[PDB]
Amino acid sequence: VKELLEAGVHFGHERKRWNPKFARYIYAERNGIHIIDLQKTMEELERTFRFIEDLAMRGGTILFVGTKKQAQDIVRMEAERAGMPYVNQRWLGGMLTNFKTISQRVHRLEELEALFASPEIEERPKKEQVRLKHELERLQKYLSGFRLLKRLPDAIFVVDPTKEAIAVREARKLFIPVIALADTDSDPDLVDYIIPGNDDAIRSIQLILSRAVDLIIQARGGVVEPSPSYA
RNA sequence: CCGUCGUCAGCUCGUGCCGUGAGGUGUUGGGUUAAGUCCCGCAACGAGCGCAACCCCCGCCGUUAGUUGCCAGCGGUUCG
Ligand SMILES: [Mg+2]
Ligand SMILES: [Mg+2]
Ligand SMILES: [Mg+2]
Ligand SMILES: [Mg+2]
Ligand SMILES: [Mg+2]
Ligand SMILES: [Mg+2]
Ligand SMILES: [Mg+2]
Ligand SMILES: [Mg+2]
Ligand SMILES: [Mg+2]
Ligand SMILES: [Mg+2]
Ligand SMILES: [Mg+2]
Numbered sequence: 216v217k218e219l220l221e222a223g224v225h226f227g228h229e230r231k232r233w234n235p236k237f238a239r240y241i242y243a244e245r246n247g248i249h250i251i252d253l254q255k256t257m258e259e260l261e262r263t264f265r266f267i268e269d270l271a272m273r274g275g276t277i278l279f280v281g282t283k284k285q286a287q288d289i290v291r292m293e294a295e296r297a298g299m300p301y302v303n304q305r306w307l308g309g310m311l312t313n314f315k316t317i318s319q320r321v322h323r324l325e326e327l328e329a330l331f332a333s334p335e336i337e338e339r340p341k342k343e344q345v346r347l348k349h350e351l352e353r354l355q356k357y358l359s360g361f362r363l364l365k366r367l368p369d370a371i372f373v374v375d376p377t378k379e380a381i382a383v384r385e386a387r388k389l390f391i392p393v394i395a396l397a398d399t400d401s402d403p404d405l406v407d408y409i410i411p412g413n414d415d416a417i418r419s420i421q422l423i424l425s426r427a428v429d430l431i432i433q434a435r436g437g438v439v440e441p442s443p444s445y446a
Numbered sequence: 447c448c449g450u451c452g453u454c455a456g457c458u459c460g461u462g463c464c465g466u467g468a469g470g471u472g473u474u475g476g477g478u479u480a481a482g483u484c485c486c487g488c489a490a491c492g493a494g495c496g497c498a499a500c501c502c503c504c505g506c507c508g509u510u511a512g513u514u515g516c517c518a519g520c521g522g523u524u525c526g
Pocket of ligand 6: 473
């Protein structure tokens with residue numbers, strides 16, 4: 216499952232826009248660029264996946280965090296493939312720390328599902344349709360992956376702990392383990408299970424996500440061959 | 447019970463987040479409207495009292511009804 220042709224996909228980026236805590240996972244600066252010791256990536260995959268694999272067979276949910284436009288679509292395929300929740304658009308404040316309240320806003324979604332599946336009155340004003348439809352069209356935009364989540368995840372898995380510091384912040388306050396693919400602009404000490412790698416190139420996001428999705432499905436009852444990606 | 451600022455676009459709440467704390471946040475920000483009006487954005491997410499709507503008068507048309515009201519037509523018409 217592990218693989219070594221990762222250097223055929225990322226080895227890292229971003230110059231002196233670095234975070235000094237990450238130096239322990241950096242090989243050298245060549246291309247005017249911080250370069251990640253890929254060896255140092257394997258070590259942490261071994262330990263991180265052990266967590267994920269051990270987390271797999273226990274039948275426990277995982278929240279998928281990626282919202283930079285470089286990792287936007289690629290998380291949506293993969294979280295569904297493993298049948299687990301994600302956030303694609305905005306990470307709402309209090310998704311975790313205020314779950315019962317945020318998820319009180321999925322009950323409005325599930326309730327819209329039914330109402331627009333006929334009939335429960337269509338003699339409701341034309342303009343109210345206009346209003347309700349768009350609201351469904353609005354709600355749908357954000358919550359499509361969060362709706363699966365019906366309880367606090369036993370872990371969360373992140374693309375950018377720097378870009379999604381808020382997510383990381385809530386998880387911490389809820390003692391939830393934090394997992395993340397994360398490059399040198401990020402804060403290492405902040406993540407429990409670290410995948411020290413490029414977090415912007417779609418290449419790198421595909422390799423590390425999918426193979427982690429596969430490790431999840433492998434120990435969660437079955438296996439399957441390849442998954443969708445743009446070249 | 448009333449005047450009043452003021453028919454002005456405002457005033458808050460629940461939870462979460464922030465601050466030792468008063469409190470902030472949301473309610474700020476772009477745009478739009480008669481309006482916290484609606485949109486877009488966002489550690490905020492919703493809820494409430496207000497705005498608006500629902501009620502009355504007027505402007506067009508219709509159905510129903512035709513006296514004490516009306517008279518288009520015809521006939522009588524002392525001439526109403
Ligand atoms: Mg990065
Ligand atoms: Mg509060
Ligand atoms: Mg202060
Ligand atoms: Mg406090
Ligand atoms: Mg307060
Ligand atoms: Mg105000
Ligand atoms: Mg205020
Ligand atoms: Mg404004
Ligand atoms: Mg006004
Ligand atoms: Mg309003
Ligand atoms: Mg706001």
